[PDB]
Amino acid sequence: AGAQDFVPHTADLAELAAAAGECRGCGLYRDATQAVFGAGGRSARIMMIGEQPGDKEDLAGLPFVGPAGRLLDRALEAADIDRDALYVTNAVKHFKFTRAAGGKRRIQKTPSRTEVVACRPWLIAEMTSVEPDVVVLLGATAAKALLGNDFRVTQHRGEVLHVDDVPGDPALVATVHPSSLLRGPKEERESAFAGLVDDLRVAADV
Ligand SMILES: O=c1cc[nH]c(=O)[nH]1
Ligand code: SF4
C-alpha cells in the first residue's frame, strides 16, 4: 500500500532521501520537481512535521525555506530552539499544486487523506531513524497524519499527547501551521505567534 515498497530497509537518512526521489506511492511525484525529504540529523531530539513542500521548497529541495519557514525560524529563535538541532520534514514529500493566471506563485493544494496515508511510510521511517523525544505537528494535515483524521488542532493547543500506534511513543504536540500566522489582523497574528512559541516551548521541555 502506498509508498511502503519504495521505502528501503535502512535508517540512513541520505539513503531514505534518495529512495524517496524514486517514490511513486501516490500520483504527486508526476508534476512535482523532486521529492523534498526531511532536513536535519538522527541525533535530533525534536522532530517537526509540516504539511507538504511549497513552491520554494519544491525547487530548493529543503523544507520550510519560504515565508512560512521564515516565520517558524522567528518562532524557534524566540523559543530558544536551534533549528539546526531539529529534524524537520512534511507529511507529504511531493508538492501538490496548481497555478492561477496572474499568480506570482504555484498555489499549494491540500493533500487528500489518501495521499497522506500513502506517504506516511516515509514519516514512519524518519521517526524510526531519528527516534525523537517529541514530535511537533504543524497544522491539521500533519497532526491528522499521526493522531487520526478527526483530530482538531484547534481543540488541543498546549497539550502533550501520546498515542499507542506511534513508533517509539514520542511525546506529540500539535500546533498551528506557521502559514496561518502570515495573514490576519495584527493583534490576531501577534497572539497566534505567542501561542506558537508557547507550544514550541512545551515540546522543547519534554
Ligand atoms: O516545508 C514546508 C513549507 C511550507 N509548508 C509546509 O507545510 N512545509
Ligand atoms: S507524495 Fe509521498 S507517497 Fe506520494 S509519490 Fe511523493 S514520496 Fe511517494
Numbering used by the authors: 2 to 207
From the publication, what sentences describe this entry?
UdgX excises uracil from uracil-containing DNA to concurrently form a covalent bond with the resulting AP-DNA. Structurally, UdgX is highly similar to family-4 UDGs (F4-UDGs). However, UdgX is unique in possessing a flexible R-loop (105KRRIH109). Our earlier studies allowed us to propose a reaction mechanism of UdgX, which involves the formation of a covalent bond between H109 of UdgX with the C1′ position of the target deoxyribose sugar concurrently with the uracil excision from this site in DNA.
Substitutions of His109 in MsmUdgX with Ser, Gly, Ala, Gln, Cys and Lys showed the loss of its covalent complex formation with DNA but gained canonical UDG activities. However, H109 substitutions by Gln or Lys, showed poor activity. However, to better understand the mechanism of uracil excision by the H109 mutants, we determined their structures along with a pentameric DNA, TTUTT by X-ray crystallography. The DNA backbone could not be modelled into the experimental electron density map in any of the mutant structures that were determined. Nonetheless, all structures revealed the excised uracil and the side chain substitutions at position 109. The structures also revealed invariant interactions of N91 and H178 with uracil. When we arranged the mutants in the order of increasing cavity sizes (left), we noted that the canonical UDG activity of the mutants increased with their increasing cavity sizes to begin with and then with a further increase in the cavity size, the UDG activity declined (right). It suggested that the initial increase in UDG activity (H109K to H109Q to H109G) occurred because of the efficiency with which the water molecule could be localized to make a nucleophilic attack on the C1′ position.
